[PDB]
């Protein structure tokens, strides 16, 4: 007969070894070094635009690289490409499922994707103009819901799934070029490193994994959260990233240190974090909680710098422009807002 119980122990002893290797470089926390840095002024953003058009809860949104066009997926089975400057609608795409979990905007603006409980990642060409009937490509493969997706370019897109996997597809052939396996739980979110050579992912096994796109395998596995990681976002310079989880805490992980540099939390905060985003300089870390509230964190000092949307329990998702000029919020009442 063969054996497993023992094989379950070499895993723990190895994890145990990695813990020590880490604990060996943990001489200080980030807040220590930033103790003399001046805290930021109270951050108070104001609504400049209100996007009207959806007929239901907004599930997810994503800014276009021009910091003007933005896409929004709703429970109304619609996908809307807006022009935030004028609040005008540019495209409107009927979906087959109301259960859209994510939507993405190709950096070129030529495409836009989305997917959800349909276990499929649908791609739409905005240039050939598939607004009414057409659907460029339907990426089938995952055996679990599609949690998130991010374009690498026009013929390459990465997806995360409830099937414990992440995949790199070739839009043209529509084949699952690479398959990133390793998580032991449902992958909830993913974030492309700025150079798109690497990308990180959060899952329900409480770990964040750094993957090499071009090489197709896991480089490192981060841990600290005792609960599911629901959101992950890369830091501006590519050397770190943030995570939000059900343990009501945000964590800053540095890639070179292979461990968390700081944690963001307060005793009054008891809901899970399902959304995280950095400001342009990375000084601010915006967090969306499951109670529809949003807190603005001072990435350096680890203290709340402010509240986004005055805790009106109306924030279901958010996003920051590449130019760091504005933040967008989705809501359960069907409206999106832009804040400066």
């Amino acid at each position: 007969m063969s054996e497993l119980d023992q094989l379950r122990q070499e895993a723990e002893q190895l994890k145990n070894q990695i813990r020590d290797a880490r604990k060996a470089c943990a001489d200080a926390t980030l807040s220590q070094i930033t103790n003399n840095i001046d805290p930021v002024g109270r951050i108070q953003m104001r609504t400049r635009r209100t996007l009207r058009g959806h007929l239901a809860k907004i599930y997810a949104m994503h800014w276009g690289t021009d910091s003007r066009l933005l896409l929004s997926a709703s429970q109304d089975g619609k996908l809307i490409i807006w022009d935030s400057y004028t609040t005008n609608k540019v495209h409107a795409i009927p979906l087959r499922s109301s259960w859209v979990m994510t939507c993405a905007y190709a950096p070129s603006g030529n495409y836009v994707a989305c997917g959800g409980l349909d276990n499929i990642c649908s791609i739409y060409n905005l240039k050939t103009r598939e607004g009414n009937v057409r659907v460029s490509r339907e990426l089938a493969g995952h055996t679990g819901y599609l949690s998130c997706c991010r374009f690498l370019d026009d013929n390459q897109i990465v997806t995360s799934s409830g099937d414990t996997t992440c995949a790199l597809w070739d839009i043209e052939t529509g084949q699952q070029t690479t398959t990133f396996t390793g998580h032991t739980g449902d992958v909830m979110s993913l974030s492309l490193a700025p150079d798109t050579r690497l990308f990180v992912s959060g899952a329900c096994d409480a770990s964040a994994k750094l993957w090499d796109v071009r090489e197709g395998m896991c480089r490192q596995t981060f841990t600290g959260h005792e609960s599911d990681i629901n959101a992950i976002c890369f830091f501006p310079n590519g050397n770190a990233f943030a995570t939000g989880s059900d343990d009501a805490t945000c964590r800053l992980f540095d890639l070179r240190a292979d461990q968390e540099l700081m944690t963001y939390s307060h005793d009054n905060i008891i809901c899970g974090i399902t959304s995280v985003s950095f400001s342009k300089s990375g000084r601010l870390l915006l967090a969306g909680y499951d109670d529809f509230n949003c807190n603005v964190w001072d990435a350096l000092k680890a203290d709340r710098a402010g509240v986004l949307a005055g805790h009106d329990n109306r924030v279901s998702c958010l996003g920051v422009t590449d130019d760091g000029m504005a933040v967008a919020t989705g809501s359960w009442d069907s409206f999106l807002k832009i804040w400066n």
């Binding site: 094989l7 290797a21 396996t181 310079n237 540095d254 300089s281 990375g282 601010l284 350096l300």
Partner: protein, 68 residues
């Protein structure tokens, strides 16, 4: 030659792969958190002064100015 892989492996096939990855990760050379923090503080502090959401935007230089 990208790697394609279906998920109908056995628990053992996954455990194997797990210890393998874990070993690779163990051979990883790490940097002192201190050195990492200094660079984080450095990058952010010198850029936060130009961050639109940190300092605020002069009304004329705001793309989302009161529409007229």
């Amino acid at each position: 030659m990208p790697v394609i892989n279906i998920e109908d492996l056995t628990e053992k096939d996954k455990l194997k792969m797990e210890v393998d990855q874990l070993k690779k990760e163990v051979t990883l050379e790490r940097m002192l958190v201190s050195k990492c923090c200094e660079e984080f503080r450095d990058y952010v502090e010198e850029r936060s002064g130009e961050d639109p959401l940190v300092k605020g935007i002069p009304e004329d230089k705001n793309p989302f100015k009161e529409l007229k």
